[PDB]
Amino acid sequence: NQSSSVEVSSESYETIFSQRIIRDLQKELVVGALFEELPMSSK
Amino acid sequence: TDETEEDAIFSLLPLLRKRLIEAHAVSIEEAFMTGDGSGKPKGLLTLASED
């Protein structure tokens, strides 16, 4: 900035850092878990 | 491995342990019989021959 008389140390010392985390849209899943499951206890 | 245990109808652990112990006993008795001197006890027959 450095326009007024007094100043600040560095341009990173007036920034607010947020820890909020955002994610874009993700594809939906359909075939993964629509079929019936068959337990097996052997080869 | 922890998958051959499931990939079978009956267990296979007691067989493993018993094979371990019996192999150990077989090897020690064989070595006492006719073991040489290279890193293993000198066998009775070897003692008799070298005396």
Side-chain angles (χ1 to χ4, degrees), chain B residues 31-37 41-51:
Chain B
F32 277 3
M33 201 46 38
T34 167
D36 204 354
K42 205 88 77 61
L44 277 169
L45 266 48
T46 317
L47 286 178
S49 190
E50 76 106 9
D51 286 2

Side-chain angles (χ1 to χ4, degrees), chain B residues 3-23:
Chain B
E3 58 180 292
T4 81
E5 210 286 318
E6 39 169 60
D7 204 297
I9 306 109
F10 56 102
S11 190
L12 278 196
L13 210 48
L15 163 77
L16 189 139
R17 306 177 58 73
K18 100 159 82 163
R19 294 239 333 168
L20 262 186
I21 307 302
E22 71 157 49

